[PDB]
Amino acid sequence: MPSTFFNLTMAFSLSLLGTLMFRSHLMSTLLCLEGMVLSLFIMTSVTSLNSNSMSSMPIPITILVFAACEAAVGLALLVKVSNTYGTDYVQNLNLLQC
Amino acid sequence: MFFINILTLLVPILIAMAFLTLVERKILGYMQLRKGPNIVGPYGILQPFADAMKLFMKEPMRPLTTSMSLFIIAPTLSLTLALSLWVPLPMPHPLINLNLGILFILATSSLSVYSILWSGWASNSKYSLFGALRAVAQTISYEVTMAIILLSVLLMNGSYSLQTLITTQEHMWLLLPAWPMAMMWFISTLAETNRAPFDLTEGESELVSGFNVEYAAGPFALFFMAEYTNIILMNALTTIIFLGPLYYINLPELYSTNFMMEALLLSSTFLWIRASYPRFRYDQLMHLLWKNFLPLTLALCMWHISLPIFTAGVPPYM
Amino acid sequence: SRAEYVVTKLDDLINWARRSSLWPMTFGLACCAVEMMHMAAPRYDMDRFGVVFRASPRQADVMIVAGTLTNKMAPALRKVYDQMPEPRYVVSMGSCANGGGYYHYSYSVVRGCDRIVPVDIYVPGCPPTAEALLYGILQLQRKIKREQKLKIWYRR
Amino acid sequence: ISAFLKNAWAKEPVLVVSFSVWGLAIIMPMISPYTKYASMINKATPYNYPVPVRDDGNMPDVPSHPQDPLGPSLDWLKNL
Amino acid sequence: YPSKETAHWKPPPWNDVDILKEKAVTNMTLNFGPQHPAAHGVLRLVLELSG
Amino acid sequence: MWFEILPGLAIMGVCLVIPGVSTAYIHKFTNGGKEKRVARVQYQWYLMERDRRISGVNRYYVSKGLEN
Amino acid sequence: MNLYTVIFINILLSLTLILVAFWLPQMNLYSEKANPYECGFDPTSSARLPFSMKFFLVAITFLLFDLEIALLLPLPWAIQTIKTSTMMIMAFILVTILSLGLAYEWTQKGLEWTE
Amino acid sequence: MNNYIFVLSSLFLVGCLGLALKPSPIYGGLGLIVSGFVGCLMVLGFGGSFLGLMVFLIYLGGMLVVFGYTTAMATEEYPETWGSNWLILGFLVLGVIMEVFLICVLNYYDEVGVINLDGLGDWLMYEVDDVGVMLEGGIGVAAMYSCATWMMVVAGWSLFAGIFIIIEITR
Amino acid sequence: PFLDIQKKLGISLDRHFMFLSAEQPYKNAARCHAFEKEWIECAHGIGGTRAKKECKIEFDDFEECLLRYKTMRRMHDIKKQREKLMKEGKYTPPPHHSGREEPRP
Ligand SMILES: C/C=C(\C)[C@H](O)[C@H](C)/C=C(C)/C=C\C/C(C)=C/Cc1[nH]c(OC)c(OC)c(=O)c1C
Numbered sequence A: 001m002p003s004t005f006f007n008l009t010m011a012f013s014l015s016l017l018g019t020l021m022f023r024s025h026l027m028s029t030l031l032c033l034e035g036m037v038l039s040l041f042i043m044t045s046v047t048s049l050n051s052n053s054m055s056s057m058p059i060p061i062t063i064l065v066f067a068a069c070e071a072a073v074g075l076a077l078l079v080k081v082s083n084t085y086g087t088d089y090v091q092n093l094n095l096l097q098c
Numbered sequence B: 001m002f003f004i005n006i007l008t009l010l011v012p013i014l015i016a017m018a019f020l021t022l023v024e025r026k027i028l029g030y031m032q033l034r035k036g037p038n039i040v041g042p043y044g045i046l047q048p049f050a051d052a053m054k055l056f057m058k059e060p061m062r063p064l065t066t067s068m069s070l071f072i073i074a075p076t077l078s079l080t081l082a083l084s085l086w087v088p089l090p091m092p093h094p095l096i097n098l099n100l101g102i103l104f105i106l107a108t109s110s111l112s113v114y115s116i117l118w119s120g121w122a123s124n125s126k127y128s129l130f131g132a133l134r135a136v137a138q139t140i141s142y143e144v145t146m147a148i149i150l151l152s153v154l155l156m157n158g159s160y161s162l163q164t165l166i167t168t169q170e171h172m173w174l175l176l177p178a179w180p181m182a183m184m185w186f187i188s189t190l191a192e193t194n195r196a197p198f199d200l201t202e203g204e205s206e207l208v209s210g211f212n213v214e215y216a217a218g219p220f221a222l223f224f225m226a227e228y229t230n231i232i233l234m235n236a237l238t239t240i241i242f243l244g245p246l247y248y249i250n251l252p253e254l255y256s257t258n259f260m261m262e263a264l265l266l267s268s269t270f271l272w273i274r275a276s277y278p279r280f281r282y283d284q285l286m287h288l289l290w291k292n293f294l295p296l297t298l299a300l301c302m303w304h305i306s307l308p309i310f311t312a313g314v315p316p317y318m
Numbered sequence C: 001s002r003a004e005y006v007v008t009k010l011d012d013l014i015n016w017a018r019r020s021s022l023w024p025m026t027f028g029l030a031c032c033a034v035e036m037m038h039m040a041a042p043r044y045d046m047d048r049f050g051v052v053f054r055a056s057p058r059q060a061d062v063m064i065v066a067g068t069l070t071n072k073m074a075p076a077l078r079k080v081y082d083q084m085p086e087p088r089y090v091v092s093m094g095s096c097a098n099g100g101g102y103y104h105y106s107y108s109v110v111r112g113c114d115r116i117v118p119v120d121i122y123v124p125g126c127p128p129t130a131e132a133l134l135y136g137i138l139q140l141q142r143k144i145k146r147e148q149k150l151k152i153w154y155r156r
Numbered sequence D: 001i002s003a004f005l006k007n008a009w010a011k012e013p014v015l016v017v018s019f020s021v022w023g024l025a026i027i028m029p030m031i032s033p034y035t036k037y038a039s040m041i042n043k044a045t046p047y048n049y050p051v052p053v054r055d056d057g058n059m060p061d062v063p064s065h066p067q068d069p070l071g072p073s074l075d076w077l078k079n080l
Numbered sequence E: 001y002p003s004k005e006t007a008h009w010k011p012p013p014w015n016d017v018d019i020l021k022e023k024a025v026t027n028m029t030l031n032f033g034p035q036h037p038a039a040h041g042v043l044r045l046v047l048e049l050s051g
Numbered sequence F: 001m002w003f004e005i006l007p008g009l010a011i012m013g014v015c016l017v018i019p020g021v022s023t024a025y026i027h028k029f030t031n032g033g034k035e036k037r038v039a040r041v042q043y044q045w046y047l048m049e050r051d052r053r054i055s056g057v058n059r060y061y062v063s064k065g066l067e068n
Numbered sequence G: 001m002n003l004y005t006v007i008f009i010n011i012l013l014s015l016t017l018i019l020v021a022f023w024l025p026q027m028n029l030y031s032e033k034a035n036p037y038e039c040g041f042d043p044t045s046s047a048r049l050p051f052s053m054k055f056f057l058v059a060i061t062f063l064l065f066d067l068e069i070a071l072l073l074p075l076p077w078a079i080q081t082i083k084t085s086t087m088m089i090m091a092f093i094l095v096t097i098l099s100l101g102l103a104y105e106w107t108q109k110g111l112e113w114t115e
Numbered sequence H: 001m002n003n004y005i006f007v008l009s010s011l012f013l014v015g016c017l018g019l020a021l022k023p024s025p026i027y028g029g030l031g032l033i034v035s036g037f038v039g040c041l042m043v044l045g046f047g048g049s050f051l052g053l054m055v056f057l058i059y060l061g062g063m064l065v066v067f068g069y070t071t072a073m074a075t076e077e078y079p080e081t082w083g084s085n086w087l088i089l090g091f092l093v094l095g096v097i098m099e100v101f102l103i104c105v106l107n108y109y110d111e112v113g114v115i116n117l118d119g120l121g122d123w124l125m126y127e128v129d130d131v132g133v134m135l136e137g138g139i140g141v142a143a144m145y146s147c148a149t150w151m152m153v154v155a156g157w158s159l160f161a162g163i164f165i166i167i168e169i170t171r
Numbered sequence I: 001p002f003l004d005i006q007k008k009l010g011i012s013l014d015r016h017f018m019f020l021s022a023e024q025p026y027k028n029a030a031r032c033h034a035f036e037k038e039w040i041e042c043a044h045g046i047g048g049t050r051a052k053k054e055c056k057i058e059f060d061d062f063e064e065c066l067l068r069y070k071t072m073r074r075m076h077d078i079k080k081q082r083e084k085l086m087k088e089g090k091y092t093p094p095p096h097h098s099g100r101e102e103p104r105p
């Protein structure tokens, strides 16, 4: 349990490192966000099953709900980005500095 | 002895697949005013073995544009899931007694999609990708209705365990309470498995054998037998859920026999349906299965939530 | 008993498999394909013999050149024959494909599919009766039945 | 509007069934008398131990034994 | 304040709508070829696809 | 004719009947004249672990009675 | 471990089968048979290019409806509670809300495809 | 089978690491799927079936849409696998090695308290109720319909309003 | 909270499943129920700065129940000494820990 919680926190940190350190595409960033969601889910679920706190077990479903809504609007923004520029790259989004 | 049990569950299912191929060809023949295979065996009871052997002697195709990893791994996954789906099936006593069998089935099938969807991408070509995207659309169409149908049906059973449906159906079938859910479940099992009229991924006249155009040998054979195994699985599910056979604790082989009868009937019905109708369009499928099936599905879910209460028919938790 | 006899019977088995299940291609160019359809039709049913079509050339064991082969359609034929995975066989069907046919002396016709694909069996007619194409298919079966491959491998 | 529903039962009868069944699901719980026995049956199920109680000496209505007259007679669940 | 780096910087538009090289319409192309069983015999039928 | 389909259907049916009767009889053979126990909740698992530790042999399916 | 065993057995069946399919037959490889099909002729471009999807809004709302399934699915356990009125009202509200969203999308032509 | 959970956690770490290296969204979605599978398996190992099954289902249905999108938008001629970049391959190997060295390090500076290689599998479940019924995960989630009905309404509003948000962003 | 609208109206939208000893769906105790109850009943009326040092024993017992670090240390020490002794040949494990006991019921 402490082992797997350490590992899950390191996994969160890896996915956070990922979504911070960008590459060309944006879809990969959204996937890193989904991975952070998933690690947080598993942490919450394991704490709830360990402590036998069945009152908090409605929390991870809420996490999944709101994370999926987040993914939805991100993907809609991606649709708009492609309709504008055509190729998903995050380097073409460099005209607000001026 | 568990391994002998694995044998008695796995090898007869494969012979059943192999002879379902024969039955398909012959039934479609006689509906088409012809006799199917009657040459290679007495009445053609060796054509499946011939097809398998010939497919495993052909040279496999490793193209140049392909992604070989996903290419080889997708049929593996396909058959593995098709063959793990038979695991919790109570016929009547299952091999693996799970408490959430239907969720296992649902997740396993939603993962079975990825065989098509990665083989199509890995096989770098056009019709391949068309088949993949059509699979995406198909799953988008059917998954919601499958889940909410199954929820509404088990909302009078009381659990996700498959074995409790046998006691839920000790004196009746769930077809008379839920024939509409049964209709929609049947047609969603028809949209699942990529079976006509909802084929739309190996649609030989629209696409030139989508998601298999670059597969030749035993890989293609694996996809084939995965499809023809999922057919029997879904018929087994329909007849465990709605067409509940007789348990009779002293006579369990009676349950197994009536299960066999009903599963054969429903599989022959799949073949019948292939022979009778033309193909849908993969946007018309969306329009159908969102604008006709999902309204009625949600309405009947409301109904089946109300019904345990205003009838005092709340089932038991074990 | 003997390794050579065992090899002979094994080869008989593999030939039986490839012979009782040879999957042609939906590749028909001209009138002769109509008689191919008629062979697929009830009277002379092909699936009776384990001969059902497949649209992709990679899920196919044989191609039947049922029509006239032109200079514009020959690269496609050869691409398709190439893409077919070995073991593979060819049936030239009709005078227009055996030889040049009724269009032998024209500017846009290849005077036989012999020049582009290697043919195993020739079926004559304009058109060949589906009865006759069926005879030729069973003759190709008989040809596969006497392949003697593993025999010669043992004798290498 | 009767004519409108007459038209909709021919064209688009799937949504008519849907709205009908929705309203029926909402209205029928209000109607039945059996609607109230559901909570009572869910309550009757003893998933957890009925923990005994100390005899203060002022517990008349509480029974001294399982099969005494007092307590909730579950015979309404029988012959419902 | 004109830096070396902000020298090429141009002032934005007044309606917040920049003029762009509108991306080329790179439709996908497909040979609905002769071997295709729906091609009634021999029919190349190059066709462009936006999906 | 249509009765020439019944052979394949018969093989198919004999093959679909075996996975059930086979599982039932294997269960009865290993566990011993008894259906294989379902343990859906921890209470049933407790009962089975108990019956294991009662036996004298680590097998939950000996069913010691009123000889004790 | 029974289930792990069944799945490993199926896995190894599939892999042994692929091994046989690859190392049993004969091979005659060359570039003209290993290149993509495209019906006799050659492709005019790559297949790793944009395929415009015209049902993306339908995909996203499928995701949200999947979450709705995830919320509806605890009902078999929610029914053995003592209340049986709060759950009724709340499930009614959830399903009705989902139907309202479906109706708005339908009327606004979100279920139609982007021609 | 005592190192089961540690192996599952390490596999999940590797899945999320290969995710964070960001190949094309195809292999990223493959990583999400494998990692959700592993997550389900450990949630079961800790005594939870429903939550794992639902992670699996949700993430599968999501990566389906990700495939449908990335074929349209996040596609290139050469999708850049993990092996495509020597640098990415090097950082992946280095990340595995670095986490292994880190585990072997923190198993030294603290005998136990963060990680226990010695006693592994001995601390997982923490006071199970050896006699019980109506105790699984699913009762706690079904409390969304009773005793936690604000989570249900707030989630439902998120979904409902998300539909409108989708339509408006896309219009 | 910031705007105590719940306390204003007496409702509990979220302030009744704030911790472990709080109304599990059927009356199944979460682990450390007693410890958390005792910590909370000490830290009532008091706020913060005074509870953090007048209710420290009870929080420390709770922290040991939930995270459970000192028992790990204790068992790890016992195991390490046992392995050392068994390697030296000093300890001889009994039947009721090698896998051969008389089961009690
Ligand atoms: C279960 C069995 C199946 C699905 C088989 O695929 C079917 C029964 C067999 C067929 C279709 C046979 C031959 C293939 C072919 C591509 C012919 C060329 C052709 N095709 C035409 O129309 C379709 C024509 O129209 C006037 C033609 O002139 C020409 C020249």
Ligand code: SF4
Pocket: C030, C031, C032, C066, C067, C068, C093, C094, C095, C096, C097, C101, C102, C125, C126, C127, C128
């Ligand atoms: S040989 Fe005769 S029937 Fe055949 S394609 Fe030529 S003209 Fe037509």
